[PDB]
Structure 1
Amino acid sequence: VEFVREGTQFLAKCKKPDLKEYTKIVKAVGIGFIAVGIIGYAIKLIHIPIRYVIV
Structure 2
Amino acid sequence: FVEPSRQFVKDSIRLVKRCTKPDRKEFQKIAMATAIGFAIMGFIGFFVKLIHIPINNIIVGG
- TM-score category (smaller protein): 0.7 to 0.9
List alignment gaps of at least 5 residues for structure 1. Answer: none
Q: Which has the larger radius of gyration?
A: 2
The residue that corresponds to 1:8 in the other structure is 13
Alpha-carbon separation, structure 2, partners of 1:6 and 1:20: 29
Q: Which runs of 4+ in 1 moved over 6 A?
A: none
Number of residue pairs the alignment of both structures matches: 53
In the superposition, the TM-score normalised over structure 1's length comes to 0.77
List alignment gaps of at least 5 residues for structure 2. Answer: 1-5
The residue that corresponds to 2:32 in the other structure is 27
The residue that corresponds to 1:43 in the other structure is 47
Q: How high is the sequence identity, in percent, across the aligned residues? A: 38
**Per the alignment, in what secondary structure is the counterpart of residue 15 of structure 1?**
coil
What RMSD in Å do the two structures reach over aligned CA positions? 1.3
